[PDB]
C-alpha cells in the first residue's frame, strides 16, 4: 500500500533533481543553438509538467478518493495525458530529426534554421491538443457506485465507445510513435553501417559500437516502460481480477521513463559533460 506510495516520492524526486538541471544545461551553454536543442528542451519542460501533475494522481489512488475539485480534475487529468502525449510526440519528431540530419544531409539544411525549429515545436504541442480533446470533452467527475465515493474519470454513454478510446490511445499513442522512432533509428544504424564499410572499416569501430548501443537503449527502454503500461489497460476490459494491485505500479513505469528520458539524453551528451 504505502510501499508503492514510497517509491512515488522517489520517482518525482528523481525527475526533480534531474530535470531542474537539464534546462540549466541547455539555455546556459547551448541556448537554443539549432533544431536539436529545441526538442531536448521540449522533453525537459514536458517532463516537469508531467511531474507536477503526477502528485495529484499518485496519492489519490491510496486514499481511493479525489479530495480536490470537480472541475479542476477535468483539466489536470487532461494535462498529464497531454504531457504524456507531448513527450512521446517529441520523441517522434526527435527521431525524425536525427534521421533526416544523418541520412539526408542535403535535405536537413532546410530544417537546421531556428525558424523551422520554433514552429515545429509549437505545432507538435498543438497535435497533442487534437488527440487529448476527446479525452477532455468526455472527462467528468462521477461516483464509482462502489461505496458512493467521489471519483474523477472518463465518462462514456455506452460501453461500446469505451473500446474505441482504449485502442485509439494505443494506436495513436503507443504503436505509431514507437514504429516511427523504431524505424527512424533503424535507418540511422543501417545507413551508418553502410558508410562505415565503404571507407574501409569492415568491423564496427569504437564510435559506431557506442552509438548503436546508445540508440538501442533508447528504444527498448521506451518499450519496457510504456508497453507494460499499455498492456494493463486493455486487459482490464476482459477480466477484472486485477484488484488494482498492478495499476499502481504500472503507472509508476510511465512516471519513470518520462522523468528519466531528459536525463538519459542530457547526462549522456556533450553539453553536460563540459558543465560537469
Amino acid at each position: 500500500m504505502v510501499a508503492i506510495q514510497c517509491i512515488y516520492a522517489l520517482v518525482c524526486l528523481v525527475g526533480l533533481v534531474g530535470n531542474a538541471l537539464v534546462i540549466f544545461v541547455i539555455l546556459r551553454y547551448a541556448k537554443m543553438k539549432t533544431a536539436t536543442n529545441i526538442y531536448l528542451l521540449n522533453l525537459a519542460v514536458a517532463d516537469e509538467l508531467f511531474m507536477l501533475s503526477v502528485p495529484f494522481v499518485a496519492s489519490s489512488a491510496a486514499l481511493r478518493h479525489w479530495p480536490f475539485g470537480s472541475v479542476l480534475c477535468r483539466a489536470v487529468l487532461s494535462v498529464d495525458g497531454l504531457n504524456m502525449f507531448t513527450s512521446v510526440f517529441c520523441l517522434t519528431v526527435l527521431s525524425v530529426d536525427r534521421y533526416v540530419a544523418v541520412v539526408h544531409p542535403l535535405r536537413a539544411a532546410t530544417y537546421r534554421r531556428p525558424s523551422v525549429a520554433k514552429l515545429i515545436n509549437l505545432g507538435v504541442w498543438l497535435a497533442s491538443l487534437l488527440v487529448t480533446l476527446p479525452i477532455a470533452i468526455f472527462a467528468d467527475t462521477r461516483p464509482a457506485r462502489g461505496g458512493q465515493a467521489v471519483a474523477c474519470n472518463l465518462q462514456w454513454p455506452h460501453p461500446a465507445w469505451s473500446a474505441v478510446f482504449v485502442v485509439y490511445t494505443f494506436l495513436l499513442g503507443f504503436l505509431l510513435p514507437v514504429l516511427a522512432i523504431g524505424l527512424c533509428y533503424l535507418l540511422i544504424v543501417g545507413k551508418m553501417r553502410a558508410v562505415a564499410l565503404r571507407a574501409g572499416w569492415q568491423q564496427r569501430r569504437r564510435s559506431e559500437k557506442k552509438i548503436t548501443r546508445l540508440v538501442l537503449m533508447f528504444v527498448v527502454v521506451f518499450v519496457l516502460c510504456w508497453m507494460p503500461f499499455y498492456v494493463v489497460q486493455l486487459l482490464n476490459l476482459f477480466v477484472t481480477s486485477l484488484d488494482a494491485t498492478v495499476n499502481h505500479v504500472s503507472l509508476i513505469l510511465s512516471y519513470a521513463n518520462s522523468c528519466a528520458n531528459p536525463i538519459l539524453y542530457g547526462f549522456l551528451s556533450d553539453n553536460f559533460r563540459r558543465f560537469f
Partner: peptide
Amino acid sequence: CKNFFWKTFTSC
C-alpha cells in the same frame, strides 16, 4: 465487469 479505466474507477 470492468471496474477500472485509464486512471480511476468507472461505474459499470
